[PDB]
Amino acid sequence: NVPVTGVTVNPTTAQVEVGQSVQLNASVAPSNATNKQVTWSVSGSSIASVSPNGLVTGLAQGTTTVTATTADGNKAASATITVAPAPSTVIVIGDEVKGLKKIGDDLLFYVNGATFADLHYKVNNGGQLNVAMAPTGNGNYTYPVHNLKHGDTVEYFFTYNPGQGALDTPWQTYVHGVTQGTPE
Amino acid sequence: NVPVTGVTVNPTTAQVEVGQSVQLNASVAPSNATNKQVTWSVSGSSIASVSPNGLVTGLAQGTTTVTATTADGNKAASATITVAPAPSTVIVIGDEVKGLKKIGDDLLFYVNGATFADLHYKVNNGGQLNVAMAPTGNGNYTYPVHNLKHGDTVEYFFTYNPGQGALDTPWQTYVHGVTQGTPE
Amino acid sequence: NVPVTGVTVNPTTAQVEVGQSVQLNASVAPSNATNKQVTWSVSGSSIASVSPNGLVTGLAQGTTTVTATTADGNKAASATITVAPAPSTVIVIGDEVKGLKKIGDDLLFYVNGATFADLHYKVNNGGQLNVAMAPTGNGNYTYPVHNLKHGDTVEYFFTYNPGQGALDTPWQTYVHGVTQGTPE
Amino acid sequence: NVPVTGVTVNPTTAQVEVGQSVQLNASVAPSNATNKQVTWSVSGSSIASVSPNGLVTGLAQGTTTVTATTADGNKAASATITVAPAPSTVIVIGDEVKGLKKIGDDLLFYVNGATFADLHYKVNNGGQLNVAMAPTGNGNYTYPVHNLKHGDTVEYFFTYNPGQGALDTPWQTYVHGVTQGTPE
Ligand SMILES: [Cl-]
Ligand SMILES: [Cl-]
Ligand SMILES: [Mg+2]
Ligand SMILES: [Mg+2]
Ligand SMILES: [Mg+2]
Ligand SMILES: [Mg+2]
Secondary structure (H helix, E strand, C coil), rough: CCCCEEEEEEEHHHHHHHHCEEEEEEEEEECCCCCCCEEEEEEEECCCCCCCCCEEEEECCCEEEEEEEECCCCEEEEEEEEEEECCCCCCEEEEECCCEECCCCEEEEEEECCCCCCEEEECCCCCCCEEEEEEEECCCCEEEEECCCCCEEEEEEEECCCCCEEECCEEEECCCCCCCEEEE | CCCCCCEEEEEEEEEEEECCEEECEEEECCCCCCCCCCCEEECEECCCECCCCCCEEECCCCCEEEEEEECCCCEEEEEEEECCCCCCECCCCCCCCCEEEEEEEEEEEEECCCCCCCEEEEECCCCEEEEEEEEECCCEEEEEEEECCCCCCEEEEEEEECCCCCCCCEEEEEECCCCCCCCC | CCCCCCCCCCCEEEEEECCCCCEEEEEEECCCCCCCCCCEEEEECCCEEECCCCCCEECCCCEEEEEEEEECEEEEEEEEEECCCCCCCCEEEEECCCCEEEEECEEEEEEECCEEEEEEHHHHHHHHCEEEEECCCCCCCEEEEECCCCEEEEEEEEEEECCCEEEECCEEEECCCCCCCCCC | CCCCCCCEEEECCCEEEEEEECEEEEEECCCCCCCCEEEEECCCCCCEECCCCCCCCCCCEEEEEEEEEEECCCCCCEEEEECCCCCCCCCEECCCCEEEEEEEEEEEEEEECCCCCCEEEEEEHHHHHHHEEEEECEEEEEEEEECCCCCCEEEEEECCCCCCCCEEEEEEEECCCCCEEECC
């Protein structure tokens, strides 16, 4: 009855971090068009996901094109979504003796003041990994875990000897981009 | 007191799949060296992990070097670990109406015989994403989820209308490299 | 028909290696419809590219959807494209003293029978990198270069001591997935 | 003759961008020690490369451990090196009609004020790809190329129609992390 003459998407560009969402809106012309329904699509779906209502969620580093197409007339408009890297901001989770630093998408596990330090860790429902932590050269130890994604659940404990004799710590649970710590 | 004169690492090369392990052995010479301690290290810890006992675990595609160094004398030997891509052999986890195909590290969700299909999923402790599944053009629908890791836990269901009206399927859970299906 | 009534894409599923191409064709319904022009699109452009004439090139591992949309009527059909990874074969490029093995997308540089080996290399218009090659324990050396992609251009030479004294080899050029060598 | 007793790595932590370098140095205890030779190793070589003289180069985002081991004593110390992502800062390379935006490690090719736009590009010694650029909805066009690394050589031109005839722009060359443009 009142045909669509056009569509625009707002915002026309947005930056999100991996795991963050932005709501897009399709503006259909004329404003009294009978059928304002749109299909949302993305040309780079490993970068960004789009819901049936234009909610865009960053999945990985990159820039992609979200398009809205009118059910009436197949007019199409698009926005550019940039998914930005995790900031390299160091977030510390634990105490003076042990814990981890979040450094973008790597975790740096640390044990301070020992004879040796091992790390026991598991990621989501994969297997346990037992590793020797690297000596810094001063009684301190470090071990980087690489390339975590948003939602990755890491269970981890240490075996170390701070003098008395070898002890195991209680397993902690860390969720990538959900567990909070204190900045730099 | 008997000094270490050499070390060999066996096997000298090995291919594993991601999340598969292989036990290396360090042979310290001579057999009656008084210190037979070795440290295991990996030059490429993104690709494979090594335990203090030489258990090497494939983490991601590529080739790396695991070295054994003697505590006595710093004698060194090394092995080549090749971590092989997930095979592209199509495994079906589902039935004739809906489910997924595992195709290497991507999952292709499918719904057959509907007027529309949506997918509701979540990976690990990430947020639920809602997508419209892409029509093939014959009343069937697909939607790929890209780049899963060994242990990644996908929880999912569908909304579709096979004639009588929209219904939701029950929550299913897939664990990447663990959940089994029908190698079709 | 003057009008278009439907479209199907032929083939409906296809697999290529990264680097390879598959021609898609759109079967426009009415056998002899007026306008048989389609728009080709891809929902996973990291994985596969599609030409205006429906040629699909694999860019990176994964599975994606390529759609043809009719100019007349905006009928849409789609094909599933699987891009398989470089198989972890071993291709030798060199002689019995030095060269590299191509192992899927990593290169294993080797020098056999030396008192030390350095590798000097450069990838595309990137900077020169100098590395000490890891000793395997028997006067041989290896060094893996990780995650090369199709068309990556590597210039390399070695400094090693075969006993007589240090020499430099002549620079060689390798082009990833173009330069060939000795299979198995 | 004066032996070795210890080593520290200077600096003990450092951050670079992908493509960039930081010189590490081993401080060997006794500072008059006759043999100050170290071996440099890195545990995550996908992330960062180390020269036989302790120059570390960032190759890919993440955090890794670079170790110095004394030739005399094989005492060892470690530095933590963070490789930070190419910032998602928009650099415009082109003019008001056509060019590209560098947005982290993705390039967004654009053509403004056309009835259609195609992009012809080639990465390094890979194949030339042809793509229909995606219309924004206003007579402008866009097409992202994804996940370039430092030194990647992109040769491109455009076919577009500014109103009265398709024309081809001349070949341009972009060198990722080398070609400069104007920030935002
Ligand atoms: Cl993609
Ligand atoms: Cl690595
Ligand atoms: Mg895209
Ligand atoms: Mg390595
Ligand atoms: Mg896709
Ligand atoms: Mg590391």
